[PDB]
Chains A and B, each alone.
Chain A
Amino acid sequence: VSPTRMNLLQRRGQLRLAQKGVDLLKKKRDALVAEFFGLVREAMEARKALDQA
């Protein structure tokens, strides 16, 4: 990378975007975990009914 003050600003902007992307991915994964645990209960429930059927 060519060393100029403009490049320094551009790279700093890139760093900022990288962090603000990491946190967004983390929020999405948290939503996914909520959905997954909501599914696991009804999954084991269907397994229960299958066992008793």
Chain B
Amino acid sequence: TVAEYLAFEHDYHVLVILTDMTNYCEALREIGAAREEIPGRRGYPGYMYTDLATIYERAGVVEGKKGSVTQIPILSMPDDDRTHPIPDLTGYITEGQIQLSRELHRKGIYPPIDPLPSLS
């Protein structure tokens, strides 16, 4: 809310950093299990896609205005698993991803960005 206000009222160029979406999804699953929703794949509620889309899709540039909003979410694939529900859905929403590599990290390489599973 604050970001969209700044960008599309005072023409700032904003950069949003959301520091862990995994904890967000944990809170979501908790409040969704207390209510007994039809679950998704590992107990995550069935509407988690729509819920995350209402956050990620609040970015971009508007025609006829000078501001902009750019998002850099950060999320930790649980067992380095690209098919876990959270990274899976987030990849289905955002435009590409920057995926880090543990093998490159073990060789002392920084930043351990392997270019093959990344995308923009």
A: which residues have CB within 8 A of B? 2, 4
Contact = CB atoms under 8 A, between A and B. Distances in A.
Nearest to B79: A2
Interface residues of B, number: 3
A25 to B, nearest CB: 31
Instruction: Tell me the dominant secondary structure on chain B's binding face.
Output: loop
4 contacts: A2-B81, A2-B82, A2-B83, A4-B83
Nearest to A2: B83
In the A-B complex, the 4 residue pairs with the smallest Cβ-Cβ separation, listed nearest first, are: A2-B83, A2-B81, A4-B83, A2-B82
Nearest to A6: B83
B81 to A, nearest CB: 6
